[PDB]
PDB file of C-alpha atoms and ligand atoms in Angstrom:
ATOM      1  CA  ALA A   1      13.943  17.798  19.897  1.00 28.65           C
ATOM      2  CA  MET A   2      12.538  15.680  17.416  1.00 29.48           C
ATOM      3  CA  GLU A   3       9.861  14.141  20.164  1.00 29.34           C
ATOM      4  CA  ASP A   4       8.437  18.183  20.453  1.00 32.30           C
ATOM      5  CA  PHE A   5       8.577  18.315  16.213  1.00 36.80           C
ATOM      6  CA  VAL A   6       6.372  15.272  16.160  1.00 36.79           C
ATOM      7  CA  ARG A   7       3.750  16.172  18.648  1.00 35.94           C
ATOM      8  CA  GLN A   8       3.028  19.875  16.428  1.00 34.98           C
ATOM      9  CA  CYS A   9       3.281  18.162  13.260  1.00 34.61           C
ATOM     10  CA  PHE A  10       0.506  15.631  13.416  1.00 33.61           C
ATOM     11  CA  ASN A  11      -2.544  16.020  14.518  1.00 33.58           C
ATOM     12  CA  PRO A  12      -3.519  14.513  17.680  1.00 34.44           C
ATOM     13  CA  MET A  13      -5.122  10.785  16.489  1.00 35.53           C
ATOM     14  CA  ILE A  14      -2.049  10.333  14.796  1.00 33.06           C
ATOM     15  CA  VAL A  15       0.544  10.837  17.092  1.00 33.10           C
ATOM     16  CA  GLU A  16      -1.794   8.615  19.097  1.00 32.71           C
ATOM     17  CA  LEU A  17      -1.873   6.465  16.397  1.00 29.69           C
ATOM     18  CA  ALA A  18       1.624   6.391  16.891  1.00 33.94           C
ATOM     19  CA  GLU A  19       2.376   5.558  20.046  1.00 33.09           C
ATOM     20  CA  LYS A  20       0.447   3.208  21.008  1.00 33.67           C
ATOM     21  CA  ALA A  21       1.477   1.287  17.785  1.00 35.19           C
ATOM     22  CA  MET A  22       5.094   2.085  18.899  1.00 36.65           C
ATOM     23  CA  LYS A  23       4.123   0.239  22.448  1.00 37.01           C
ATOM     24  CA  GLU A  24       2.668  -2.276  20.904  1.00 35.99           C
ATOM     25  CA  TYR A  25       5.237  -3.832  19.561  1.00 32.50           C
ATOM     26  CA  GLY A  26       7.918  -2.628  22.316  1.00 30.60           C
ATOM     27  CA  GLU A  27       9.191   0.019  21.398  1.00 32.02           C
ATOM     28  CA  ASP A  28       9.771   4.048  23.182  1.00 29.26           C
ATOM     29  CA  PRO A  29       8.753   7.248  21.184  1.00 27.94           C
ATOM     30  CA  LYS A  30      10.985   9.577  23.799  1.00 28.96           C
ATOM     31  CA  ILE A  31      13.545   7.594  22.812  1.00 27.24           C
ATOM     32  CA  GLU A  32      13.597   6.327  19.702  1.00 27.84           C
ATOM     33  CA  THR A  33      12.205   9.611  18.229  1.00 28.66           C
ATOM     34  CA  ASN A  34      13.370   9.384  14.164  1.00 31.76           C
ATOM     35  CA  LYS A  35      11.429   5.888  14.692  1.00 32.82           C
ATOM     36  CA  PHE A  36       8.482   7.844  16.330  1.00 28.93           C
ATOM     37  CA  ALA A  37       8.490  10.960  13.467  1.00 31.19           C
ATOM     38  CA  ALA A  38       8.585   8.056  11.205  1.00 31.81           C
ATOM     39  CA  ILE A  39       5.521   5.847  12.666  1.00 33.36           C
ATOM     40  CA  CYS A  40       3.301   9.217  12.355  1.00 32.47           C
ATOM     41  CA  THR A  41       4.286  10.152   8.530  1.00 32.67           C
ATOM     42  CA  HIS A  42       3.603   6.657   7.641  1.00 30.85           C
ATOM     43  CA  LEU A  43      -0.338   5.968   9.134  1.00 27.94           C
ATOM     44  CA  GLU A  44      -0.831  10.478   7.595  1.00 28.21           C
ATOM     45  CA  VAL A  45      -0.318   9.054   3.993  1.00 26.65           C
ATOM     46  CA  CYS A  46      -2.141   5.883   4.690  1.00 31.33           C
ATOM     47  CA  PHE A  47      -4.932   7.527   6.062  1.00 30.08           C
ATOM     48  CA  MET A  48      -4.505  10.727   3.675  1.00 32.58           C
ATOM     49  CA  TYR A  49      -4.354   7.744   0.499  1.00 35.24           C
ATOM     50  CA  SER A  50      -7.800   6.437   2.445  1.00 33.58           C
ATOM     51  CA  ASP A  51      -9.721   9.453   2.248  1.00 28.44           C
ATOM     52  CA  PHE A  52      -8.850   9.724  -1.626  1.00 29.23           C
ATOM     53  CA  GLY A  53     -11.468   7.612  -2.463  1.00 26.45           C
ATOM     54  CA  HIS A  54     -15.449   4.193   0.246  1.00 26.13           C
ATOM     55  CA  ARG A  55     -12.951   2.899  -2.275  1.00 28.64           C
ATOM     56  CA  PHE A  56     -10.440   2.012   0.460  1.00 30.45           C
ATOM     57  CA  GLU A  57     -10.053  -0.044   3.778  1.00 26.76           C
ATOM     58  CA  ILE A  58      -7.572   1.212   6.399  1.00 25.47           C
ATOM     59  CA  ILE A  59      -6.036  -1.581   7.803  1.00 25.17           C
ATOM     60  CA  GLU A  60      -2.856   1.007   9.497  1.00 24.68           C
ATOM     61  CA  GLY A  61      -3.655   2.079  12.407  1.00 22.39           C
ATOM     62  CA  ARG A  62      -5.768  -0.728  13.940  1.00 24.33           C
ATOM     63  CA  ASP A  63      -4.372  -2.750  16.843  1.00 23.79           C
ATOM     64  CA  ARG A  64      -3.071  -6.127  15.927  1.00 25.78           C
ATOM     65  CA  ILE A  65      -6.399  -7.630  16.123  1.00 25.11           C
ATOM     66  CA  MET A  66      -8.704  -5.784  14.831  1.00 25.96           C
ATOM     67  CA  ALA A  67      -6.230  -5.548  11.734  1.00 24.74           C
ATOM     68  CA  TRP A  68      -6.143  -9.467  11.231  1.00 24.64           C
ATOM     69  CA  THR A  69     -10.092  -9.988  11.469  1.00 22.44           C
ATOM     70  CA  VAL A  70     -10.740  -7.099   8.680  1.00 22.14           C
ATOM     71  CA  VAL A  71      -7.880  -8.965   6.930  1.00 20.42           C
ATOM     72  CA  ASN A  72      -9.967 -11.833   7.379  1.00 24.12           C
ATOM     73  CA  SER A  73     -13.327 -10.416   7.064  1.00 24.11           C
ATOM     74  CA  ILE A  74     -11.966  -9.156   3.394  1.00 22.88           C
ATOM     75  CA  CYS A  75     -10.265 -12.555   2.701  1.00 26.36           C
ATOM     76  CA  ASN A  76     -13.236 -14.372   3.414  1.00 28.25           C
ATOM     77  CA  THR A  77     -15.491 -12.349   1.528  1.00 26.64           C
ATOM     78  CA  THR A  78     -13.168 -11.753  -1.414  1.00 24.06           C
ATOM     79  CA  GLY A  79     -11.382 -15.108  -2.257  1.00 28.99           C
ATOM     80  CA  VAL A  80      -8.287 -12.838  -2.183  1.00 29.90           C
ATOM     81  CA  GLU A  81      -5.471 -14.619  -0.929  1.00 31.60           C
ATOM     82  CA  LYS A  82      -5.005 -13.933   3.012  1.00 33.25           C
ATOM     83  CA  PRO A  83      -0.849 -11.627   3.262  1.00 30.90           C
ATOM     84  CA  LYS A  84       1.200 -13.698   4.857  1.00 30.14           C
ATOM     85  CA  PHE A  85       2.283 -10.162   6.353  1.00 28.18           C
ATOM     86  CA  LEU A  86      -0.102  -6.826   7.915  1.00 25.48           C
ATOM     87  CA  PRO A  87      -0.743  -4.540   4.437  1.00 21.92           C
ATOM     88  CA  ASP A  88      -1.842  -0.854   4.977  1.00 22.76           C
ATOM     89  CA  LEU A  89      -5.024  -0.441   3.261  1.00 22.55           C
ATOM     90  CA  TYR A  90      -7.775  -2.715   0.765  1.00 17.14           C
ATOM     91  CA  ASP A  91      -8.789  -1.400  -2.339  1.00 17.72           C
ATOM     92  CA  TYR A  92     -12.353  -2.482  -2.866  1.00 17.02           C
ATOM     93  CA  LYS A  93     -12.248  -1.370  -6.644  1.00 19.79           C
ATOM     94  CA  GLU A  94      -9.050  -3.679  -8.116  1.00 23.56           C
ATOM     95  CA  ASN A  95      -9.578  -5.824  -4.937  1.00 18.63           C
ATOM     96  CA  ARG A  96      -5.772  -6.149  -3.994  1.00 18.42           C
ATOM     97  CA  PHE A  97      -4.386  -5.020  -0.364  1.00 21.12           C
ATOM     98  CA  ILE A  98      -1.717  -2.226  -0.148  1.00 19.59           C
ATOM     99  CA  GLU A  99       1.266  -1.815   1.343  1.00 18.36           C
ATOM    100  CA  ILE A 100       2.133   1.513   1.433  1.00 12.75           C
ATOM    101  CA  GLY A 101       5.948   2.684   2.197  1.00 14.63           C
ATOM    102  CA  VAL A 102       7.102   5.910   2.719  1.00 13.56           C
ATOM    103  CA  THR A 103      11.056   6.452   2.833  1.00 14.47           C
ATOM    104  CA  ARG A 104      13.684   8.729   3.229  1.00 14.63           C
ATOM    105  CA  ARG A 105      16.467   6.969   0.534  1.00 15.02           C
ATOM    106  CA  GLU A 106      15.627   6.251  -2.893  1.00 14.04           C
ATOM    107  CA  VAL A 107      11.886   4.600  -4.032  1.00 10.75           C
ATOM    108  CA  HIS A 108      13.669   2.435  -5.917  1.00 12.86           C
ATOM    109  CA  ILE A 109      15.587   1.204  -3.727  1.00 14.82           C
ATOM    110  CA  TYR A 110      13.123   0.820  -1.118  1.00 16.07           C
ATOM    111  CA  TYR A 111      10.342  -0.458  -3.491  1.00 15.61           C
ATOM    112  CA  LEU A 112      12.810  -3.470  -3.726  1.00 14.64           C
ATOM    113  CA  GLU A 113      12.876  -3.831  -0.058  1.00 13.72           C
ATOM    114  CA  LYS A 114       9.656  -3.755   0.343  1.00 12.04           C
ATOM    115  CA  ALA A 115       8.645  -6.211  -2.354  1.00 13.49           C
ATOM    116  CA  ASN A 116      11.907  -8.786  -1.132  1.00 13.45           C
ATOM    117  CA  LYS A 117      10.511  -8.323   2.228  1.00 14.71           C
ATOM    118  CA  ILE A 118       6.836  -9.202   1.229  1.00 19.15           C
ATOM    119  CA  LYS A 119       6.309 -11.274  -1.372  1.00 17.34           C
ATOM    120  CA  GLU A 120       3.068 -10.921  -5.381  1.00 18.87           C
ATOM    121  CA  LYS A 121      -1.055 -10.137  -5.178  1.00 18.76           C
ATOM    122  CA  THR A 122       0.055  -7.179  -2.387  1.00 15.57           C
ATOM    123  CA  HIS A 123       0.172  -4.181  -4.371  1.00 16.27           C
ATOM    124  CA  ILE A 124       2.830  -2.036  -3.624  1.00 16.45           C
ATOM    125  CA  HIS A 125       3.320   1.724  -3.585  1.00 16.95           C
ATOM    126  CA  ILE A 126       6.337   3.918  -2.311  1.00 18.68           C
ATOM    127  CA  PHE A 127       6.472   7.354  -1.787  1.00 17.33           C
ATOM    128  CA  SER A 128       9.565   9.444  -0.970  1.00 20.06           C
ATOM    129  CA  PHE A 129      10.384  13.285   0.691  1.00 18.04           C
ATOM    130  CA  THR A 130      10.970  14.186  -3.180  1.00 20.05           C
ATOM    131  CA  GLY A 131       8.164  13.771  -4.537  1.00 19.68           C
ATOM    132  CA  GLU A 132       8.785  10.334  -6.200  1.00 20.80           C
ATOM    133  CA  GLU A 133       6.696   7.523  -6.153  1.00 19.83           C
ATOM    134  CA  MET A 134       7.384   3.987  -7.258  1.00 20.82           C
ATOM    135  CA  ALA A 135       4.306   1.245  -7.680  1.00 23.31           C
ATOM    136  CA  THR A 136       4.074  -2.361  -8.446  1.00 22.76           C
ATOM    137  CA  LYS A 137       3.401  -2.285 -12.736  1.00 22.84           C
ATOM    138  CA  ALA A 138       3.598   1.531 -12.136  1.00 21.30           C
ATOM    139  CA  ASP A 139       0.065   1.160 -11.582  1.00 23.17           C
ATOM    140  CA  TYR A 140       0.256   4.390  -9.438  1.00 19.16           C
ATOM    141  CA  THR A 141      -3.639   3.797  -8.151  1.00 18.83           C
ATOM    142  CA  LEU A 142      -4.665   7.208  -7.063  1.00 15.99           C
ATOM    143  CA  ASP A 143      -5.248  10.151  -9.153  1.00 15.57           C
ATOM    144  CA  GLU A 144      -3.200  12.793 -10.287  1.00 15.45           C
ATOM    145  CA  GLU A 145      -4.294  15.174  -7.631  1.00 17.06           C
ATOM    146  CA  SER A 146      -4.397  12.749  -4.553  1.00 17.99           C
ATOM    147  CA  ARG A 147      -0.696  11.734  -5.187  1.00 19.99           C
ATOM    148  CA  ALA A 148       0.164  15.147  -5.307  1.00 16.66           C
ATOM    149  CA  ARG A 149      -1.319  16.269  -2.110  1.00 21.24           C
ATOM    150  CA  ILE A 150       0.040  13.004  -0.351  1.00 20.18           C
ATOM    151  CA  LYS A 151       3.686  14.455  -2.223  1.00 16.70           C
ATOM    152  CA  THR A 152       3.073  17.977  -0.859  1.00 18.05           C
ATOM    153  CA  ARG A 153       2.852  16.434   2.845  1.00 19.60           C
ATOM    154  CA  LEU A 154       5.374  14.591   2.383  1.00 18.03           C
ATOM    155  CA  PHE A 155       7.765  17.571   1.457  1.00 16.47           C
ATOM    156  CA  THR A 156       6.266  20.083   3.945  1.00 15.35           C
ATOM    157  CA  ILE A 157       6.844  17.505   6.984  1.00 13.55           C
ATOM    158  CA  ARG A 158      10.437  17.082   5.411  1.00 14.05           C
ATOM    159  CA  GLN A 159      10.542  21.248   5.927  1.00 12.43           C
ATOM    160  CA  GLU A 160       9.498  21.566   8.741  1.00 15.25           C
ATOM    161  CA  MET A 161      12.206  19.757  10.093  1.00 11.96           C
ATOM    162  CA  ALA A 162      14.406  21.135   7.727  1.00 13.93           C
ATOM    163  CA  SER A 163      13.432  24.191   9.461  1.00 14.23           C
ATOM    164  CA  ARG A 164      14.416  22.844  12.674  1.00 11.63           C
ATOM    165  CA  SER A 165      17.218  20.901  11.963  1.00  9.01           C
ATOM    166  CA  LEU A 166      16.019  17.955  12.403  1.00  8.93           C
ATOM    167  CA  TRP A 167      16.234  16.747   9.206  1.00  8.47           C
ATOM    168  CA  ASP A 168      19.110  15.091   8.448  1.00  7.59           C
ATOM    169  CA  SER A 169      19.075  13.203  11.363  1.00  5.72           C
ATOM    170  CA  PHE A 170      15.578  12.048  10.631  1.00  9.23           C
ATOM    171  CA  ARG A 171      17.168  11.060   7.110  1.00  9.67           C
ATOM    172  CA  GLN A 172      20.130   8.858   8.226  1.00 12.12           C
ATOM    173  CA  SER A 173      18.038   7.446  10.663  1.00 15.00           C
ATOM    174  CA  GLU A 174      16.242   4.928   7.787  1.00 16.64           C
TER     175      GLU A 174
HETATM  176  O1  LIG B 201       6.535  -0.093   6.698  1.00 14.85           O
HETATM  177  C1  LIG B 201       5.792  -0.348   6.863  1.00 14.85           C
HETATM  178  O2  LIG B 201       5.304   0.884   5.719  1.00 14.85           O
HETATM  179  C2  LIG B 201       4.582  -0.680   7.610  1.00 14.85           C
HETATM  180  O3  LIG B 201       3.368  -0.914   7.066  1.00 14.85           O
HETATM  181  C3  LIG B 201       5.023  -0.922   8.522  1.00 14.85           C
HETATM  182  C4  LIG B 201       4.203  -1.504   9.745  1.00 14.85           C
HETATM  183  O4  LIG B 201       3.018  -2.237   9.658  1.00 14.85           O
HETATM  184  C5  LIG B 201       4.630  -2.006  10.856  1.00 14.85           C
HETATM  185  C6  LIG B 201       4.262  -0.529  11.748  1.00 14.85           C
HETATM  186  C7  LIG B 201       4.879   0.047  12.643  1.00 14.85           C
HETATM  187  C8  LIG B 201       6.511  -0.325  12.779  1.00 14.85           C
HETATM  188  C9  LIG B 201       7.083   0.190  14.154  1.00 14.85           C
HETATM  189  C10 LIG B 201       6.598  -0.227  15.418  1.00 14.85           C
HETATM  190 CL1  LIG B 201       7.312   0.763  16.842  1.00 14.85          CL
HETATM  191  C11 LIG B 201       5.258  -0.094  15.137  1.00 14.85           C
HETATM  192  C12 LIG B 201       4.372  -0.599  13.888  1.00 14.85           C
HETATM  193  C13 LIG B 201       6.156  -2.752  11.121  1.00 14.85           C
HETATM  194  C14 LIG B 201       6.135  -3.822   9.972  1.00 14.85           C
HETATM  195  C15 LIG B 201       5.495  -4.931  11.354  1.00 14.85           C
HETATM  196  N1  LIG B 201       4.040  -4.115  11.502  1.00 14.85           N
HETATM  197  S1  LIG B 201       2.638  -5.149  11.155  1.00 14.85           S
HETATM  198  O5  LIG B 201       3.020  -6.407  10.716  1.00 14.85           O
HETATM  199  O6  LIG B 201       1.905  -4.347  11.237  1.00 14.85           O
HETATM  200  C16 LIG B 201       2.251  -5.559  12.387  1.00 14.85           C
HETATM  201  C17 LIG B 201       1.779  -4.525  13.823  1.00 14.85           C
HETATM  202  C18 LIG B 201       0.424  -4.339  13.347  1.00 14.85           C
HETATM  203  C19 LIG B 201       0.205  -3.253  14.538  1.00 14.85           C
HETATM  204  C20 LIG B 201       0.970  -2.200  15.315  1.00 14.85           C
HETATM  205  C21 LIG B 201       2.527  -3.236  15.785  1.00 14.85           C
HETATM  206  C22 LIG B 201       2.099  -4.141  14.579  1.00 14.85           C
HETATM  207  C23 LIG B 201       3.624  -2.583  11.724  1.00 14.85           C
HETATM  208 MN1  LIG B 202       1.738  -1.112   7.735  1.00 14.45          MN
HETATM  209 MN1  LIG B 203       3.451   0.890   4.931  1.00 16.34          MN
END
């Protein structure tokens, strides 16, 4: 059962935030179990990305109002243009917002989908469960070790799902 997998694979904080995000956005984690797993995974990557730095402000994982309050605050103190859509992080070193993508498909495919969706100051960084990444301008932002740890965690999630015969379902759900 994917729902039970998610509850054993991710730390309690992450699972809580994923459940809250789903309800805030209408969804039931008991039904949309692949989505529930994807949201946890994406949350964890965002937190790991941010912990590898206080270089980053984490925007993902906050309730909508707080997320926009933070984004507004950053825009007001940097003059960086306000994004049309909530991004995932702000990079205080490069002074740009970052959109983090996690895909079960090819990274170039998901990159295009994201870049098309969001539109040009927001830096995009895409990770696969295959150790692939693609980023705006091939600027991967983090050092090699930080990206390697993210890649390892994603691949580990995939294999833990594969252990329980849940990977194939999860992969086709995107
Ligand atoms: O696709 C991403 O890489 C990504 O960063 C997605 C997001 O930020 C989502 C996350 C989300 C998805 C589904 C659900 Cl049910 C809830 C939240 C989905 C896109 C829209 N937004 S959102 O624009 O940030 C609005 C939001 C904020 C907080 C909680 C719920 C909703 C939240
Ligand atoms: Mn997001
Ligand atoms: Mn994202």
